[PDB]
Amino acid sequence: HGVCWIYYPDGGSLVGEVNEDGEMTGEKIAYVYPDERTALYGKFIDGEMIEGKLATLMSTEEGRPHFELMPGNSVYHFDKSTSSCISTNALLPDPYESERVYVAESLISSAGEGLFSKVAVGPNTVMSFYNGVRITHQEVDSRDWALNGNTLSLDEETVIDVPEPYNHVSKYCASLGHKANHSFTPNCIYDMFVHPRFGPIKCIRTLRAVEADEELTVAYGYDGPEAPEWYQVELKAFQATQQKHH
Ligand SMILES: N#Cc1cccc(C[C@@H](NS(=O)(=O)c2ccc3c(c2)CCNC3)C(=O)N2CCCC2)c1
Ligand SMILES: C[S@@+](CC[C@H](N)C(=O)[O-])C[C@H]1O[C@@H](n2cnc3c(N)ncnc32)[C@H](O)[C@@H]1O
């Protein structure tokens, strides 16, 4: 039988035999993460994940994938956030992210928590997901700017936010992208990502080879005019230490 592999620009894919309407509908469909090994296998309807069981892509034979279910009954489903509901299982971690990153005290003085690599990876590796509630740019701009620590732009219309109390891992740990701190010498970037559980979000992708236990950092997008005070102070301190030609 025929099998269709739909790769997203981020490297992840949807794989399965399509139905008679050319739809990704059935009991043996899978979402495969960018490592081409970690998979969520099971029931999908028109490419939407209804029941995706944690599995490993063991091999492929002429485009036909062979999956092995992972023990532990880790199950996922499409659960795209709204402006107020971040997730319906806030404490169920993403399996791909769980094996790549962890949260610990930041190496940046007084910067709270940070995001760290659990493993050695090459450049251009998806490490973490930036999921959150979906709000407009106008809502972010119009509201009290002190509520905008975790507001990451998705596109010209939408912002992804991780508001209180979900910015604490004890209340929300389905994704951990909101834990990466700012640096003017970052080792990661935010990039688009099409997630089977979270829907259209952003991810943290390495810019270079990263070693295990390095802090993962991204250059934040300000402008700068009305940037947070910690950013303005860091900009001046960073500039003062840059070596110059005499
Ligand atoms: N302008 C602005 C602005 C407002 C809030 C936050 C930010 C920084 C934010 N920059 S952003 O995603 O390009 C962004 C977010 C919100 C808004 C903008 C840009 C444009 C103005 N509308 C609101 C960022 O890089 N973050 C990294 C971790 C979380 C936030 C910029
Ligand atoms: C997206 S959160 C990153 C994780 C946050 N540190 C935490 O503990 O949950 C953004 C917040 O982290 C802090 N932060 C990020 N980068 C920083 C830096 N380079 N120096 C100081 N504080 C920083 C600021 O409080 C900012 O509002």
Side-chain angles (χ1 to χ4, degrees), residues 2-155 158-222 224-225 227-246:
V3 181
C4 181
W5 292 77
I6 308 157
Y7 283 83
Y8 296 104
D10 55 58
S13 56
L14 201 51
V15 52
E17 182 185 330
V18 304
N19 76 353
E20 291 90 337
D21 285 329
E23 285 154 31
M24 277 286 210
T25 302
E27 305 300 301
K28 299 190 189 182
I29 308 285
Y31 168 77
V32 179
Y33 281 94
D35 62 2
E36 310 183 84
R37 293 277 293 159
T38 315
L40 312 176
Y41 176 77
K43 187 184 189 158
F44 285 68
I45 302 177
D46 189 26
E48 187 172 291
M49 183 171 71
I50 308 304
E51 178 196 58
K53 291 190 186 176
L54 186 55
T56 308
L57 176 54
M58 298 309 283
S59 57
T60 304
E61 175 87 299
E62 302 191 328
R64 310 260 302 152
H66 176 64
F67 296 101
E68 196 162 299
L69 294 177
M70 185 61 75
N73 181 48
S74 286
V75 187
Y76 315 86
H77 65 263
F78 181 68
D79 195 38
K80 193 181 162 182
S81 68
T82 64
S83 60
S84 58
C85 179
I86 197 165
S87 172
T88 60
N89 194 344
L91 299 173
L92 161 65
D94 180 276
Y96 170 94
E97 179 185 64
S98 306
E99 292 311 311
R100 283 156 186 85
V101 297
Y102 65 90
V103 173
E105 187 185 47
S106 185
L107 303 181
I108 305 145
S109 175
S110 304
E113 296 185 324
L115 192 64
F116 291 81
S117 191
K118 211 179 255 203
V119 294
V121 292
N124 311 130
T125 310
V126 172
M127 298 297 280
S128 186
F129 299 121
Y130 204 118
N131 181 51
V133 296
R134 285 160 203 278
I135 51 168
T136 63
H137 275 276
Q138 182 72 286
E139 179 175 316
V140 173
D141 299 334
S142 295
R143 79 188 184 178
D144 193 315
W145 285 11
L147 295 168
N148 304 339
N150 292 354
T151 55
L152 179 73
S153 185
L154 174 63
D155 54 41
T158 314
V159 168
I160 294 155
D161 192 17
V162 178
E164 279 274 359
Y166 307 119
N167 60 311
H168 308 272
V169 303
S170 51
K171 276 285 169 299
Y172 177 83
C173 67
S175 64
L176 297 168
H178 60 287
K179 293 291 177 179
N181 280 330
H182 167 80
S183 180
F184 291 110
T185 59
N187 55 10
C188 296
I189 52 142
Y190 295 117
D191 215 355
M192 301 307 277
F193 201 88
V194 185
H195 202 282
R197 178 183 177 185
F198 308 128
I201 57 162
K202 287 214 160 160
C203 72
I204 284 161
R205 185 190 289 277
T206 69
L207 278 169
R208 56 162 175 86
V210 174
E211 284 175 291
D213 307 310
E214 273 200 68
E215 190 166 354
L216 297 182
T217 65
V218 282
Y220 284 18
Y222 292 107
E229 302 304 325
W230 64 262
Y231 182 91
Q232 294 188 42
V233 175
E234 177 48 29
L235 182 70
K236 198 199 158 62
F238 170 84
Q239 284 171 343
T241 67
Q242 294 319 292
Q243 189 183 357
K244 279 156 182 69
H245 170 82
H246 287 282

